[PDB]
């Protein structure tokens with residue numbers, strides 16, 4: 204069995220290997236990359252996402268989110284308070300202000316220590332989940348707005364044609380902005396490209412051990428667990444590496460820098476934080492190997508998780524028994 208310790212693998216494809224996206228994902232899996240739940244892909248030196256980032260300041264962040272924490276430093280939830288719209292140029296200036304800027308630090312490990320010590324005492328503002336793309340239309344390789352759609356994959360594998368669309372999302376971050384522990388909708392893959400700025404640190408639980416994280420989460424968030432049998436779908440709970448280690452939960456960590464791709468694999472729980480002002484682009488995707496994970500994915504039916512239009516068909520076709528209850532949650 205390849206990668207039996209479920210380590211995060213790092214790949215350096217050549218320009219020739221960067222042509223065929225599906226083939227390269229399948230290669231990485233042949234080497235056991237999925238066992239970690241997360242992989243890093245460093246593009247060939249010939250490649251670029253676009254020519255420059257000099258003209259992005261007028262992008263609008265219609266609903267910036269202030270991430271307010273509750274709990275203790277290693278075990279907390281966050282809620283998202285909506286803020287007034289601002290442009291990317293306004294948000295960059297805000298991120299660099301004395302109130303929000305990254306503190307002085309020695310290295311990524313020192314910064315990580317400072318994040319876990321102090322995150323809860325601040326409320327950073329995240330420009331998350333903005334439909335759009337920063338890939339140039341002429342970028343032919345690993346262009347996250349030109350991937351095969353999940354609807355077409357389902358149709359290719361299973362023969363059923365369904366409604367829905369699959370487009371990318373932009374994330375503008377600042378110091379301490381946080382992504383809570385989650386798997387993707389319908390336990391899909393994700394791919395995330397860090398276009399510019401400061402790094403993003405990731406934590407990940409191997410897919411084969413995801414239920415260990417779920418059991419800890421039920422223990423640590425006991426009211427939330429009574430509320431919903433899949434409350435990590437709400438994307439609000441944080442658990443630190445120290446707490447994970449104390450509870451024997453297998454995980455790994457890695458820091459993504461600008462110009463790098465990360466892939467999350469089906470049922471790979473992940474969480475993390477931004478080091479300072481940055482911009483990432485991410486989208487979900489599927490492969491043939493996903494189908495069995497989609498059929499088994501948990502679902503939130505309490506009403507909190509509320510998701511895209513396109514998840515309807517995935518539930519309807521892959522999980523017809525759950526469909527009725529899940530849809531009640533959506534309505």
Ligand SMILES: O=C(O)CNC(=O)C(=O)O
Pocket residue numbers: 374381382393394395467473483485486
């Ligand atoms: O970058 C973020 O805030 C969150 N991203 C992801 O969870 C991802 O790409 O799957």
Ligand SMILES: [Mg+2]
Pocket residue numbers: 258259260261262
């Ligand atoms: Mg602009």
Ligand code: NI
Pocket residue numbers: 385386387393467473
């Ligand atoms: Ni994710």
Ligand SMILES: [Zn+2]
Pocket residue numbers: 430431432433434436437503504505506507508
């Ligand atoms: Zn729920």
